[PDB]
């Protein structure tokens, strides 16, 4: 901020305004904050140590009900579809060792 | 002297006008005021038709310029690339 004050006090507005506008940190942080509660406390561990299919039943329903908060956070289409296939990837891995 | 003119070839245009002529003369005689009535008539009618024609003459630059100019005040076209590309400096005064 002291360097920014140097450039502001020296009437050079370029680097000062670009320090917040040219840097995409502001929009990156706001999208991060939009996805911030969605990424904290994710029940993937419910899927990790689940060897019994009943644990997997309740686990699958639990993870998707926690994922239900993407209605308010603008989730993308293709991102959600690759997400679903990733969920099925770990489902398949768990079932492979289960068999 | 009310006038109504319609024209609609590939469009629609209507001219509606009238002049509230006001003139006087003493009724001197009959033939004198007959042809004198014609004198006032020929005066007002030649005047009115001519004036109407010149109103049509001075319309590209006055009446239409009250509505829509033919060219902007800068007498050039619009550099759409300029306006869209950047703000002309309108933010600065």
């Amino acid at each position: 901020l002291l360097t920014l004050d140097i450039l502001k006090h020296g009437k050079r507005f370029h680097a000062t305004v670009s320090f917040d506008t040219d840097t995409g940190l502001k929009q990156a942080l706001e999208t991060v904050n939009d996805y911030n509660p969605l990424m904290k406390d994710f029940p993937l561990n419910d899927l990790l140590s689940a060897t019994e299919l009943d644990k997997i039943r309740q686990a699958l329903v639990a993870i998707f009900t926690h994922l239900r908060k993407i209605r308010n956070t603008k989730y993308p289409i293709q991102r959600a579809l690759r997400l679903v296939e990733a969920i099925s990837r770990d489902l398949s891995s768990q079932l492979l060792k289960v068999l | 002297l009310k006038i109504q003119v319609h024209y609609y070839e590939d469009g629609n245009v209507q001219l509606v006008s009238h002049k509230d002529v006001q003139d006087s003369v003493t009724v001197s005689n009959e033939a004198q005021t007959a042809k004198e009535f014609i004198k006032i008539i020929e005066h007002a009618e030649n005047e009115y038709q001519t004036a109407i024609s010149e109103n049509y003459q001075t319309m590209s630059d006055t009446t239409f310029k009250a509505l829509r100019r033919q060219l902007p005040v800068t007498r050039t076209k619009i550099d759409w690339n300029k306006i869209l590309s950047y703000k002309i400096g309108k933010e600065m005064q």
Binding site: F13 | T74, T76, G89
Partner: protein, 370 residues
């Protein structure tokens, strides 16, 4: 991206430069190139051949001063490269031409080749990140703060009037004659010869410029004063001599209002203003007459603005308020306007990037010339 835009105001006589955002141009010097005339004999002499700036001004006797730009058109590009390179030297900027976008002032109606080759010079030898060529009148009005009005400038090699409407400089009303400061000095040199005093050396033409800058004025009545014998004030040369001028001091800048003295069918300054205003939309004439801005060093003569008012009143229609402004930074008008323009966030979108220049070429510059 770069550090900061450098506003380099050219000029056929005095180049002016500095960074954008600056208040006044910190670096100003004459636009000439002086190389020695005599013979290097003694060792330990002034090393180096071409001199520009204060050193060329100091040892003025040795040099054979020439100008690379005349009438806003570059005649020699090598001397211009050395001048621009001098601007980026340790004596003026101490920077590199690789981290600074460049705002470049340029006079109207000039050939395309000026912008083209000047752009090649910058983007190739200097490799600047972004170049932006602009007018000069637009910058002067931006420097005064107002927005619609004509701009009457007379620098060292050009003079023109531009009716600017909110920034859109009307390109169909820019009258431009080539009678400016340097030519007035040239005609003054001719009159000094007719007085008896001869000055013909290239490094003496500068003394003629000094005389023009501190001993000439403009007569209100152009003829009534010619029919009288003035006080004939003296003048001290750098040599220490004495020159009595006489009538050769008011008739010398009279050239600007009548280029018949030089023998040319051009017009005066007043006619350039009146024709620039009258070749515009009739709905803006009163607004333009109420806003006239002067700039350029040739508008510094004594009695200049007053005579301009008299002349314009003789040419403008009756009972129309004529108003000529004359700020105190007529020498720095285009540079201060460049400092205001380039210091804005829209300048990022207003320049030409180096990548773009490498893609399209000179056509990209003519495309985005405004």
């Amino acid at each position: 991206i770069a550090n900061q835009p450098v506003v380099i105001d050219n000029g056929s006589g005095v180049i002016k430069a500095g960074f954008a955002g600056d208040q006044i141009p910190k670096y100003c010097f004459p636009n000439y190139v002086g190389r020695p005339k005599h013979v290097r004999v003694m060792a330990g002499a002034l090393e180096g051949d071409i001199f520009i700036g204060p050193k060329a001004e100091e040892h003025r006797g040795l040099l054979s001063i020439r100008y690379p730009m005349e009438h806003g058109i570059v005649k020699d590009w090598n001397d211009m490269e050395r001048i621009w390179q001098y601007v980026y030297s340790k004596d003026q900027l101490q920077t590199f031409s690789e981290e600074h976008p460049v705002l470049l002032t340029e006079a109207p109606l000039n050939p395309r080749k000026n912008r083209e080759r000047a752009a090649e010079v910058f983007f190739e030898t200097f490799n600047v990140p972004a170049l932006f060529i602009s007018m000069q009148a637009v910058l002067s009005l931006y420097a005064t703060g107002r927005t619609t009005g004509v701009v009457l400038d007379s620098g060292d090699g050009v003079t023109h009037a531009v009716p600017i409407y909110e920034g859109f400089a009307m390109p169909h009303s820019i009258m431009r004659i080539d009678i400016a400061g340097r030519d007035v000095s040239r005609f003054l040199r001719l009159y000094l010869r007719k007085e008896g005093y001869d000055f013909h050396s290239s490094s003496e033409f500068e003394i003629v410029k000094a005389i023009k800058e501190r001993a000439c004025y403009l007569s209100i009545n152009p003829q009534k004063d010619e029919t009288l014998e003035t006080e004939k004030a003296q003048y001290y040369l750098p040599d220490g001599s004495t020159i009595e001028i006489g009538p050769s001091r008011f008739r010398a800048p009279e050239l600007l209002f009548r280029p018949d003295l030089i023998g040319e069918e051009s017009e005066g300054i007043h006619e350039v203003l009146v024709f620039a205003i009258q070749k515009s939309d009739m709905d803006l004439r009163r607004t333009l007459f109420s806003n006239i801005v002067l700039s350029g060093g040739s508008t510094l003569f004594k009695g200049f603005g007053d005579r301009l008012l008299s002349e314009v009143k003789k040419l403008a229609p009756k009972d129309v308020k004529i108003r000529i402004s004359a700020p105190q930074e007529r020498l720095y008008s285009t540079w201060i306007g460049g400092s205001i323009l380039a210091s804005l966030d829209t300048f990022k979108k207003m320049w030409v990037s180096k990548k773009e220049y490498e893609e399209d070429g000179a056509r990209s510059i003519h495309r985005k010339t405004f």
